[PDB]
Amino acid sequence: MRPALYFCGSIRGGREDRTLYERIVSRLRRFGTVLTEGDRLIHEQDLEWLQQADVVVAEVTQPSLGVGYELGRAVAFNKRILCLFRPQSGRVLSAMIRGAADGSRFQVWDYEEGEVEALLDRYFE
Amino acid sequence: PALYFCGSIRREDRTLYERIVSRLRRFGTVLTEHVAGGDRLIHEQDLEWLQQADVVVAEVTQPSLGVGYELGRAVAFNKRILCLFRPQSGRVLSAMIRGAADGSRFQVWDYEEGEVEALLDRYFE
Ligand SMILES: O=C(O)c1ccc2c(c1)CN(Cc1csc(N3C[C@@H]4C[C@@H](CN(c5ccccc5)C4)C3)n1)CC2
Ligand SMILES: O=C(O)c1ccc2c(c1)CN(Cc1csc(N3C[C@@H]4C[C@@H](CN(c5ccccc5)C4)C3)n1)CC2
Numbered sequence A: 001m002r003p004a005l006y007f008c009g010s011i012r013g014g015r016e017d018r019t020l021y022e023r024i025v026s027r028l029r030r031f032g033t034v035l036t037e038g039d040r041l042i043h044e045q046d047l048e049w050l051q052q053a054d055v056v057v058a059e060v061t062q063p064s065l066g067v068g069y070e071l072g073r074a075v076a077f078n079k080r081i082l083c084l085f086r087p088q089s090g091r092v093l094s095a096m097i098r099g100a101a102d103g104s105r106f107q108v109w110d111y112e113e114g115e116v117e118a119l120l121d122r123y124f125e
Numbered sequence B: 001p002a003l004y005f006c007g008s009i010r011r012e013d014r015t016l017y018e019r020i021v022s023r024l025r026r027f028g029t030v031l032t033e034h035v036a037g038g039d040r041l042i043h044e045q046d047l048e049w050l051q052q053a054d055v056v057v058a059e060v061t062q063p064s065l066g067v068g069y070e071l072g073r074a075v076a077f078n079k080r081i082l083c084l085f086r087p088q089s090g091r092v093l094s095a096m097i098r099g100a101a102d103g104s105r106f107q108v109w110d111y112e113e114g115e116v117e118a119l120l121d122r123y124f125e
């Protein structure tokens, strides 16, 4: 059985954010199966993918109620979670996400655009 | 009835949060106005307020990982939730929040700034 990996990022992410999302998702395929590969239907199916994940990887650089909501549901589902944040964006990460980290099943890793594949190789090995 | 309020930590939204809290005081104790690193302290205090609440009121106009996270945790705790969104902002509310609504235990209400007080009366009576 392959590990089930759930990726989440903002639907409002820009061109830079979306290039990094594709780079994270491409690298995730090496370590397991990426589950993703009206509004009520999106909510229900997203929660079903999330419930079936072994690991949740969230890119939390861009503020998002949807990503935050997925992280809150993921914690209550007892999921192992890795949050990836780019301090080069000029933003400060929400105290709720940074404060949810416990250094083990909820980690928040700051990163520079260039090292994302190397940080993902390290986390998943 | 113990009431929990949340809004984005990131002007016109900040004065609205004060009016919302003042109006909620008329219906019950607002837990969120009464009082490991700093982020973890904010997370833990916020979760203590959230677990003690009977009703969760969230201002969801500004995209926020923190507000979304609180809403995710609130749903999992089976809390009664009211989300307030201002369509005048020009934003499209996240599908995760709009899709979480069931018209009963979780409701999302579009409102106009001047009429927020009336909407809270209609909900709490
Ligand atoms: O920001 C919001 O308010 C929001 C609202 C709804 C959802 C999310 C975020 C994220 N959820 C998890 C998820 C799965 S794949 C993924 N990304 C991130 C970006 C780009 C691309 C496709 N995404 C997507 C996929 C399906 C439905 C909607 C958006 C959005 C890859 N994110 C899905 C539902
Ligand atoms: O958007 C974020 O990433 C974010 C990060 C952290 C928290 C929130 C949001 C919201 N939580 C709920 C809460 C309680 S009183 C409240 N509001 C909303 C605004 C203005 C004012 C003071 N707030 C506040 C109060 C205590 C601690 C921190 C911020 C923030 C009144 N919101 C608290 C923690």
Ligand SMILES: [Cl-]
Binding pocket: A075, A100, A101, A102, A106
């Ligand atoms: Cl946690």
